[PDB]
Design a protein around this nucleic acid. Structure first.
Ligand code: MG
Ligand code: MG
Ligand code: MG
Ligand code: MG
Ligand code: MG
Ligand code: MG
Ligand code: MG
Ligand code: MG
Ligand code: MG
Ligand code: MG
Ligand code: MG
Ligand code: MG
Ligand code: MG
Ligand code: MG
Ligand code: MG
Ligand code: MG
Ligand code: MG
Ligand code: MG
Ligand code: MG
Ligand code: MG
Ligand code: MG
Ligand code: MG
Ligand code: MG
Ligand code: MG
Ligand code: MG
Ligand code: MG
Ligand code: MG
Ligand code: MG
Ligand code: MG
Ligand code: MG
Ligand code: MG
Ligand code: MG
Ligand code: MG
Ligand code: MG
Ligand code: MG
Ligand code: MG
Ligand code: MG
Ligand code: MG
Ligand code: MG
Ligand code: MG
Ligand code: MG
Ligand code: MG
Ligand code: MG
Ligand code: MG
Ligand code: MG
Ligand code: MG
Ligand code: MG
Ligand code: MG
Ligand code: MG
Ligand code: MG
Ligand code: MG
Ligand code: MG
Ligand code: MG
Ligand code: MG
Ligand code: MG
Ligand code: MG
Ligand code: MG
Ligand code: MG
Ligand code: MG
Ligand code: MG
Lengths: 101, 138, 113, 59, 117, 154
RNA sequence: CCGUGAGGGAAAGGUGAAAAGAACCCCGGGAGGGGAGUGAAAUAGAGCCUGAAACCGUGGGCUUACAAGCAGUCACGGCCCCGCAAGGGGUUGUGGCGUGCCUAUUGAAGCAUGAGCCGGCGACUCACGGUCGUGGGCGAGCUUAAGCCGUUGAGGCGGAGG
RNA sequence: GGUGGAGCCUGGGAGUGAGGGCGCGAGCGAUAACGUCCGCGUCCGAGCGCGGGAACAACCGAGACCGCCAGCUAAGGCCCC
RNA sequence: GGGAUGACCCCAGGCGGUAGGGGAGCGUUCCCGAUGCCGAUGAAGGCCGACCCGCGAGGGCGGCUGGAGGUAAGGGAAGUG
């Protein structure tokens, strides 16, 4: 098919059997989440309004991971000001199942 | 995140008649065309705009008293080496320069921009030398 | 295989000899013999000396035939400098370094059976 | 210790880049026509002796 | 008891030297120069890990425009249409449709200019 | 810097040499120089409230008694300093080196016999101190030593 | 070593368990090497344990002669390298953004100070008083100093005194 | 009215006692000065962190805990750069 | 506020920063712990790492080098970065 869902503040182009990681969903690997949040379809379901109130895509949560570390270094000249922090964005990897529209 | 990357695509040519167009107003469009910001394939770091053959340069329109009053400057590193050439003289001789200079000063300035200019062929016109297709535009 | 030589602590500045050693790198033994034979530099003498020793090794020690031989590798590394005083004007004493080089030449064979 | 001095240490690149020309050029030789030997052109080498040309020793 | 430097300084030094691999000249061979180059990078990355977001708000917009321009309207209008046609979704990121689904896109335009005509 | 074997002579003139300003190669600086706030001899001993020492001595014992790991004695069959002998009486008493034992008694003969045992720490009754009671697992005093202990607790 | 002199005043430690310290052969005037041989190890071969960094080289991978820069960073792309894959490592062609560090100043990229680079040494301590705070002990009270007896990494006593 | 990194009381530790630009009200000056001296305010100082102003401490916008290949705005902009 | 004191949970605000104040931690030398425990099936140090933990200082584990020392939890001192 092909759809456009809204999850974790962002919105992705999902499809049949695949998926990357989205924000951190408070679900559990041993579960299935539904992103009722959905717009557009392969055959044009353009949510004439916010959402397509009726359709939805189903995705099974593979699990949760912790992104690659990013480093945030703050430095301010002529002031002995330095700060080093390590960062890891929690993620929940999904697997798209089907688009019920 | 979705990809975008268009990947190596054959460039299209474009023929333009400047007959009575006013440069500056024409020049701008040759620029957007030169960098191809008119196509959803737009990619900043790659030359992927159209090639642009401009014919009938010279005989180009310009308003006000820009003839005699618009001056082109050129500086040799020598003392008192600043030359002032009024528009009329540039058209009278080296007329394609008027349209090239104009367009040039409207392209990004680094290596790429420098390269897109090599993608712009101007002639005193009419008729040009490129039979590699040539969709005419307005 | 290959046959190594090396002449440690020669007492000629490296930069100076790297200069003649680069002339022979890759050439054949025979051809490299003629080069530093007519190369107008103090270095040649040393290089030739180590070059000829590697040749004498490749045959006697690892039997390789004086023919196939060619300088596969050759480079000259820097050895401990000899610090010396040089009386300058107005009392000033300067330290002139009499450098020293470790010349190394390694040989190999060209064609086969 | 006097007047002009270099402003900055010349970087390794800049130093080496200058010596792009210090590369030595091979001696020019040719085969001697009288004997099997290499020697510089227009010169009398020991090996042969030059069809008489005041040569070294030989019996 | 005497507590000499010992090994603690070589380690801190070679730590930084590693984050400097790849840098030009002394900016990768000497702790002082490297230490300095890093301060800057630390900052650019942070500074840039933001411009990025804007660098694409950018990209997408140049495209969405270029694309809907072949349909008779400009970026301004299009966005107004959508935003007004309530289909406030698209999301510059996903209006990449212009490249993949030129029809699913076009439909979106019609809807846009319709929301204004 | 005032105790190194160097002269206090100013090394180079104050001004115009192109060198840093220095005086005598005896100040903190300069490798062979002197040490800044280095250690000096000093007495680390302070007077601890006797009442606190008493309390602790008892507490140390009490605590050992609570685990039933205390064990006072009347006498020792294997007397007459001779490890073999103590090792003997040891079995009888329940000590086999499984636990470290603090054996305090005024009998030099017994003392002599234990002592060399890797698991035995030996003391004269009037030497009963907290540190030892704690560094050992089991405490073994004789009745004559349990008294001196008493004459010291309140 | 310096200074006429009083006087000043360095640097420099480590083969291996054992010299078993490399016979002899080969290139060389020697030095030095290559073999052989000793040894568990010879990149323990002799100012020889380990042997970092600056610095100098040889070989390879990516990449550069229309570009312009506090040398990096963000983004794509090419080539090379890992792993089955997803993914990752090296390099850098374009694009975007970018005014070294320290110090001192109202204000510094600053054409103000300091630093050639690296390694090692290098600066808020200790004693006794004082004043708060705090962890405990005892509290109409608390506490000993010198010294004495004991140990020989055992603690007691000692009320002068505060 | 007002629950605020408001106030008040007691005590421990400070640092600071070269300030600067802008606006407004005065003096000085020659209603000259990136001048000088006070008054309120505000920024810089310590926000040489971010956007705008071509560039630019103090002008306009706005107070940066970290992440996002999402969204709405501010000043300023919307012909090309 | 939960309070089953679960120091983990939802709720509510806040989190630019020089001089400075305050609070937590990392690492170095040495002492108790040690007549212990690691160690030639390799100590300390060195050279690598795209892996694991931590906000960070670091702590791991792995390969190479090295060839005889090292030293937990838990505390104690100080020539400690
Ligand atoms: Mg700066
Ligand atoms: Mg400042
Ligand atoms: Mg002279
Ligand atoms: Mg003289
Ligand atoms: Mg010199
Ligand atoms: Mg070089
Ligand atoms: Mg946007
Ligand atoms: Mg936007
Ligand atoms: Mg003396
Ligand atoms: Mg003195
Ligand atoms: Mg004197
Ligand atoms: Mg000087
Ligand atoms: Mg000393
Ligand atoms: Mg003298
Ligand atoms: Mg052997
Ligand atoms: Mg060894
Ligand atoms: Mg040894
Ligand atoms: Mg060694
Ligand atoms: Mg090295
Ligand atoms: Mg190379
Ligand atoms: Mg050009
Ligand atoms: Mg080129
Ligand atoms: Mg760049
Ligand atoms: Mg100053
Ligand atoms: Mg200040
Ligand atoms: Mg400068
Ligand atoms: Mg300067
Ligand atoms: Mg000054
Ligand atoms: Mg300074
Ligand atoms: Mg200088
Ligand atoms: Mg240094
Ligand atoms: Mg150092
Ligand atoms: Mg005190
Ligand atoms: Mg005090
Ligand atoms: Mg306050
Ligand atoms: Mg106060
Ligand atoms: Mg004042
Ligand atoms: Mg003033
Ligand atoms: Mg003043
Ligand atoms: Mg003020
Ligand atoms: Mg004032
Ligand atoms: Mg003010
Ligand atoms: Mg005024
Ligand atoms: Mg002023
Ligand atoms: Mg004024
Ligand atoms: Mg004043
Ligand atoms: Mg402020
Ligand atoms: Mg500002
Ligand atoms: Mg600035
Ligand atoms: Mg600004
Ligand atoms: Mg600006
Ligand atoms: Mg804030
Ligand atoms: Mg908007
Ligand atoms: Mg507005
Ligand atoms: Mg803060
Ligand atoms: Mg020590
Ligand atoms: Mg011990
Ligand atoms: Mg073994
Ligand atoms: Mg140690
Ligand atoms: Mg110190």
């Amino acid at each position: 098919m092909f759809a456009i869902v809204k999850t974790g503040g962002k919105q992705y182009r999902v499809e049949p059997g695949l998926k990357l990681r989205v924000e951190k969903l408070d679900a559990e690997p041993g579960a299935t989440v539904e992103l009722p949040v959905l717009l557009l379809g392969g055959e044009k379901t353009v949510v004439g309004t916010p959402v397509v109130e009726g359709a939805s895509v189903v995705a099974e949560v593979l699990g949760h991971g912790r992104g690659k570390k990013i480093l945030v270094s703050k430095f301010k000249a002529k002031v002995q000001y330095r700060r080093k922090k390590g960062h890891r964005q929690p993620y929940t990897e999904l697997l798209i199942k089907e688009i019920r529209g | 995140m979705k990809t975008y990357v268009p990947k190596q695509v054959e460039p299209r040519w474009v023929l333009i008649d400047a007959e009575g167009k006013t440069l500056g107003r024409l020049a701008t469009k040759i620029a957007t065309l030169l960098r191809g910001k008119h196509r959803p394939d737009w990619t900043p770091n790659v030359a992927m705009g159209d090639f642009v053959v401009v014919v009938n340069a010279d005989k180009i329109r310009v308003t006000g008293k820009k003839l005699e009053q618009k001056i082109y400057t050129r500086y040799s590193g020598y003392p008192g080496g600043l030359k002032k050439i009024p528009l009329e003289k540039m058209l009278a001789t080296h007329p394609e320069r008027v349209l090239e200079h104009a367009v040039k000063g409207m392209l990004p300035k680094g290596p790429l921009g420098r390269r897109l200019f090599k993608r712009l062929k101007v002639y005193a016109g009419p008729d040009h030398p490129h039979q590699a297709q040539r969709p005419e535009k307005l | 295989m290959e046959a190594k030589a090396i002449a440690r602590y020669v007492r000629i500045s490296p930069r100076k000899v790297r200069l003649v050693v680069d002339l022979i790198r890759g050439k054949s033994l025979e051809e490299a013999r003629n080069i530093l034979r007519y190369t107008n530099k103090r270095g040649a003498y040393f290089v030739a000396k180590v070059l000829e020793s590697a040749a004498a090794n490749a045959v006697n020690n690892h039997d390789m035939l004086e023919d196939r031989l060619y300088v596969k590798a050759a480079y000259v590394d820097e050895g401990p400098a000899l610090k010396r005083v040089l009386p300058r004007a107005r009392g000033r004493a300067d330290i002139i370094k009499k450098r020293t080089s470790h010349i190394t030449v390694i040989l190999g064979e060209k064609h086969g059976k | 210790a006097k007047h002009p001095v270099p402003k900055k240490k010349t970087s390794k690149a800049r130093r080496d880049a200058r010596r792009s020309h210090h590369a030595l050029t091979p001696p020019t030789l040719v085969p001697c026509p009288e004997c099997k030997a290499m020697k510089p052109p227009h010169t009398v080498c020991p090996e042969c002796g030059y069809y008489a040309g005041r040569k070294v020793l030989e019996v | 008891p005497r507590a000499k430097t010992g090994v603690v300084r070589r380690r801190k030094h070679k730590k930084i030297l590693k984050l400097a691999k790849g840098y030009w000249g002394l900016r990768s061979k000497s702790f002082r120069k490297a230490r300095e180059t890093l301060f800057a990078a630390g900052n650019y990355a942070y500074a840039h890990r933001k411009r990025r977001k804007r660098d694409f708000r950018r990209l997408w917009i140049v495209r969405i425009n270029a694309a809907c321009r072949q349909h008779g309207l400009n970026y301004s209008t299009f966005i107004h249409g959508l935003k007004k046609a309530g289909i406030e979704v698209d999301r510059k990121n996903l209006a990449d449709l212009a490249v993949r689904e030129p029809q699913v896109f076009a439909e979106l335009v019609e809807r846009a200019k319709a929301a204004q005509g | 810097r005032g105790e190194v074997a160097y002269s206090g002579r100013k090394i180079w003139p104050q001004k115009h040499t192109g060198r840093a300003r220095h005086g005598d190669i005896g100040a903190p600086i300069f490798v062979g120089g002197g040490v800044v706030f280095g250690p000096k001899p000093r007495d680390y001993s302070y007077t601890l409230p006797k009442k606190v020492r008493k309390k602790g001595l008892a507490m140390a014992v009490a605590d050992r008694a609570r685990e039933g790991k205390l064990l006072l004695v009347e006498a020792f069959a294997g007397v007459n300093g001779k490890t073999k002998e103590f090792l003997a009486w040891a079995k009888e008493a329940g000590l086999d080196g499984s636990e470290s034992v603090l054996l305090v008694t005024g009998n030099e003969l017994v003392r002599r016999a234990a002592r060399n045992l890797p698991w035995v720490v030996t003391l004269a009754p009037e030497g009963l101190n907290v540190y030892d009671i704690v560094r050992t697992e089991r405490l073994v005093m004789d009745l004559d030593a349990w008294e001196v202990f008493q004459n010291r607790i309140g």
